[PDB]
Structure formats: C-alpha cells, structure tokens
Symmetry: C2
Subunit: 254 residues, 2 copies
C-alpha cells in the first residue's frame, strides 16, 4: 500500500569526517534496497557534502528546519528555496526540540509546512505528547490539535505528499519507546482524524514513528498496520541504522 | 594601527550558481590585496561550497549566526565546533534582523559570544540603535548597553580578537548611511567606553561600520579614525564589494 520511509535525523552531530564515513558506508550498504525509502538530515552545512557522497545510491537528503522567508534581508535564516537548491527533499518541522527549546508554535510550524509544500518539498511534520499529557489522557487531544493547525487552516490536500512523524516526547532519547500496540493506536487515530476530512488523503499519508527506535525494536513496530516507517535519531549515527532499514524493507515485501 | 576588515554579510541570498560566480570572480578580483582582510558570510548550507571555491585566495569565511550548543539532541541548531570544522572564522551575532525578527536578546547574544570565543572563532557583534532611539538621543545608552552585555559579564578580555560592527538600524537597507561624522563619533564612543575598562584592549578591537555602505561612501567613511572597516550588506552581492575593498586597502596604506 504506502511505500515506507526510514528517515534519520542526525541532530547536532556531524563533521566532514563523519559525513564522509557514514554516507559512503550507507551508500555501499544500501545498494539494491528497493522496499524502503531512506533519507538522512545532516546538519545544514553538511547537506551538500552528503548530497555528493550519496550520489550513485538513492539516499534522499533532508534538513532539520526551514524558516519563513525565501530571500532577502533575513540574517541567519533558512530558505526553503535554498534547501531545495542544495538538494534537500524531506524537511523536518515541529520536532520537540524546536517546540520546547526553541519555543516554536503550532501556528509557526503550520506556516512553515505551508512554505515547503508551496516550494515542492516534503514536510516531515513532527507531533507528539509529553509524559504529563500522556498520563493525563490528553494524547488524542494534543496530537489532533497539532495536526489541525495545518488541517483546519490549509486543508487535507496539504497532506497530499507529506509525512507525519509521531514522536512521543517521553520516548525521545529516553530509551523508552511506545510499544507496537501504543505506536499503532496513535497512528490509527491520526489517520482516522485526517480521514474524517478526506479519506483519500488519509490513506496516502506516511505516518512514521520516532522515539527510541533501534534495531531490536524496529521489527515489532513495523509489524503494525499504520506504522509506515520510522524517524531515527540516535541510531542514525550507528551502523544499526541499516538494520532498521532492513526491518522496513523485507517486512514490506511480505 | 588596526588592519582593516571588510566583511560582506550575504543575508538570505544565495544558490549554487551565484556562490560559484561571486566567489570565483572575487577570488580572481582580490589577487594581491594585502592592505585589507576580507571575509564573506554565505548562507550556511553554502559555507563549504564557498570555502572550497575561495581556496587559494585569502578570503576568510564566516557565518550569520550560531546557537549555544556544540553537540547533541538539538534539532535545527548551529554548532560552533561545526562552523569551525567547515571552515568559518567570522560569525555574525546580534544583527538587528535577529534582534527584531527573531527576538534575540542581549543575554543570549552574549552567551553566543562566549561560545564563539571559547571555540576560537571571531565574533562580529553587531550593535546599533533605531531611528526613534536616535531622535531621542539614546544612541549612547543603547550601544553601551548592548556592548556591556558582554563587557560586564565576560570582561574586557572578551574583546581581544573580537569585532564590533556598529550598524545603525535606520541605516540598514535604507540607503540612509551615517555621515562620517556620525559614524566616527559613535565608533570613538564605543572605543572610549571599552577603554575605560581596559585601554589596551580598546586599541585592538576592530569597530566596523555597517548601514547602507557602497563604493562611493566607503572612502569618506574610512577616513575616520575609529572606523576600522565595513560590514557590507547588499553590495556583497554586487561587484562593487571589491571597489569597497580597494577603498579600505588604499587608504590603509596611506
């Protein structure tokens, strides 16, 4: 049905050496892989280098943010038009680290989703609830809110070709991921919630699960029905990333 | 006494082709200029590209902002160890565009200065006042403030090897530049202000002028005693940046 995506968000980790190594190894390690779609998001100053190193393979490049302006007098910003130019396709927006540390709002993340779409880039929209919200029973409500900032404003056609990445905040870097059962309950909720507005768009939107995915759990998770892939953090930097991609690929070709 | 620095800030402008064009022509057009130190700040995902193209010449590279972490779980952040790895020395911080549009604060802009310095990068701390602040007579108070954020927390020492770039906000992109008399008077004030803490450091701090500078006004402005160079905005993208550089160079060698 949906073609799986495993995307690796490298976060604040990269170097000329590490980019030379990981991507050239991945390139030989992922030769003839056709059941999964793979992308890496190097730190911005390395997107171009990893883009040249990934040539010959089908590793897709991504980026970890965009800002709202395409050009002009905006020091220190990230143009979507330039991300596009340099070869990024998958732009992470709305990750918990920008939401908490950088106090990024739903309204701002939605206007960014808006830009990326308009440009022709795949947003990987992160959503997730915190442990507090989780205990409270608010997971449906948080997730739904967060999807709605795009859904109620721009409409379900916005998700035609986007990626939602459910990343339970209490699961990011903690080591405590959602069980397959948990994971899938929310991916089904998400899908139901877009489908209420347009089921044709719900059926196609990739819902990746992110939040302590590693080789051991990659397969239990992927067995689920509404889990379309993964957004990998820590293990992106480890060779174990290939094993996570192999989970999504061979299970795909069941 | 002080060797001039002309840093071009590209703002949110760039592509693979303009970066090829500008830098190769600059590289060729700056052959033999020793009276001036030159640095360019391409947008982040092009510092590597430009660094490479600038190899051979003595065009130093820079960057338009940093964030406070060097490594980690910080999606979408810029690390100083990473800017340093890709080859950037001059990191602009506190520019009005970040200060207004990104609500960046002095306590923050100071913490970013600390971070640059500790990594061995050269901070280019923008300072300045708005038109309103100018009219009320607050130029002194505003500028001293902004400088004191680093001076009172970190000491006079923080300025050894650091650049201050006075850009009056009413002057940026407006076409309305400070007269050499305005420029000089303020640059002399800043230097007088640091000197009252440590005189020896105040003689070596480069104080650049920025705010609608171009080939015709570079000369008249460089004639002032306390104006050690130029932060160029929009003419960085023009061939007129080299004419600006020849004005700092020829008059330095008086």
């Amino acid at each position: 049905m949906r073609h799986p995506l495993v995307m690796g968000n490298w976060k604040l980790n990269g170097s000329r050496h590490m980019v030379h190594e990981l991507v050239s190894n991945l390139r030989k390690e992922l030769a003839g892989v056709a059941g999964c779609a793979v992308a890496i998001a190097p730190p911005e100053m390395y997107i171009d280098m990893a883009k040249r190193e990934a040539e010959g393979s089908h590793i897709m490049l991504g980026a970890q943010n965009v800002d709202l302006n395409l050009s002009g007098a905006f020091t220190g910003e990230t143009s979507a038009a330039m991300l596009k130019d340099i070869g990024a396709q998958y732009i992470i927006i709305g990750h918990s680290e920008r939401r908490t540390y950088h106090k990024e709002s739903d309204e701002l993340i939605a206007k960014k989703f808006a830009v990326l779409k308009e440009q022709g880039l795949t947003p990987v929209l992160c959503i997730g609830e915190t442990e507090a919200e989780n205990e409270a029973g608010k997971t449906e409500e948080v997730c739904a809110r967060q999807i709605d900032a795009v859904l109620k404003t721009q409409g379900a056609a916005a998700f035609e070709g986007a990626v939602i990445a459910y990343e339970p905040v209490w699961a990011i870097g903690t080591g405590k991921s959602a069980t397959p059962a948990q994971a899938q309950a929310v991916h089904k909720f998400i899908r139901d919630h877009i489908a209420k507005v347009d089921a044709n768009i719900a059926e196609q939107v990739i819902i990746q699960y992110g939040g302590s995915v590693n080789a051991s759990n990659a397969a239990e998770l992927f067995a689920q029905h509404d889990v379309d892939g993964f957004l990998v953090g820590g293990a992106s930097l480890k060779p174990e990333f290939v094993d996570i991609i192999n989970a999504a690929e061979a299970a795909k070709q069941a």
